[PDB]
Copies of this chain bind each other. A is one copy, B any other.
Amino acid sequence: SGFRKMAFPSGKVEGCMVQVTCGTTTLNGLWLDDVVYCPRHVICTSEDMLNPNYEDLLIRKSNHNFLVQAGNVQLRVIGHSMQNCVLKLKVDTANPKTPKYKFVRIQPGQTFSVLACYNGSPSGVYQCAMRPNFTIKGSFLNGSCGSVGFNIDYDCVSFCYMHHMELPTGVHAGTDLEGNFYGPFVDRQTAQAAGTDTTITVNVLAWLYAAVINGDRWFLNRFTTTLNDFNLVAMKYNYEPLTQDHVDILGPLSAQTGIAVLDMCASLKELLQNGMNGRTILGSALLEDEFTPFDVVRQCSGVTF
């Protein structure tokens, strides 16, 4: 019993964190095999950030301008290339702690663990979701650039995010491990703002099924809804549209609890209309949207209470 925002054990990722320095800029890098991946803005000054020409800044650099520190050992850079917004530094030593890994690009609504690092040293781990507006509500200070997001499955680490910047609203933007940004953001200090954020509907539904599994049904009602009527109501509360794919994905949770997806949608509609009336759901007074259907199945018991 219980329901917590659970992160993956971070050990496999801790053994990959290194410190990368170029001139006066210092940030984190991910050391996998003989390559260190880090944000390309390590080659920038603060002035350069307004309109940086990364190709012009990179061509003026040699291998020995990049200082890479792994623990107390200095790694030697023997090559460098840029791939989108990520710099790839070829080093002379393969990481003996390299786990089994994949680079995966995630979609909005998907969750992942973040290992927040400063000076190549991990400081904390937390769980978060890729918001529909492609930002993440993380906890990052200056020097956290290069910190990574990941999931773990059967000892294979799937790297999905690398931290690049904080937007004026305090939210965070970054790239996949191929250097392609999530969202319409650029690694430029330009007037860019996150789009209006929305609630991840399929995740709120999954969390309502998690509450049922753990023994709570106060919020259920005798009504059902059509998918279209649910979406017309949900859009009014800034909730993301629920698609047939979402309904299909909620199938296992519907079978484990005996509650049809459109019946759970009718309960969500009523919760949006009435609020919680001094009651909580899994220890929360707000409708939680950072647990996916997969996360609920992973954390919760296979036997409903």
Give the B-binding residues of A (Cβ under 8 A). 1-12, 14-15, 115-119, 121-126, 128, 137-141, 143-144, 166, 170-172, 214-215, 280, 283-286, 299-305
Contacts and interface: CB of A to CB of B under 8 A. Distances in A.
10 contacts: A1-B170, A4-B128, A4-B139, A6-B124, A9-B10, A9-B11, A9-B115, A10-B125, A122-B304, A123-B305
Contact of A304 (B119, B137, B170, B284): B119
Contacts of A1: 139-141, 166, 170
Contacts of A305: 121-123
Given A1-B166, A11-B122, 18 more contacts: A1-B139, A2-B139, A2-B170, A6-B125, A6-B139, A7-B124, A7-B126, A9-B11, A10-B125, A11-B15, A117-B304, A123-B303, A124-B299, A125-B125, A141-B300, A141-B302, A283-B286, A285-B286
B170 A9 contact: no
Given A137-B283, A139-B2, A302 B125 contact: no
B286 A125 contact: no
A122 to B, nearest CB: 4
Nearest to A97: B11
Given A10-B9, A139-B3, A304 B123 contact: yes
B299 A9 contact: no
A11 B8 contact: no
A15 B14 CA distance: 12
Contacts of A116: 6
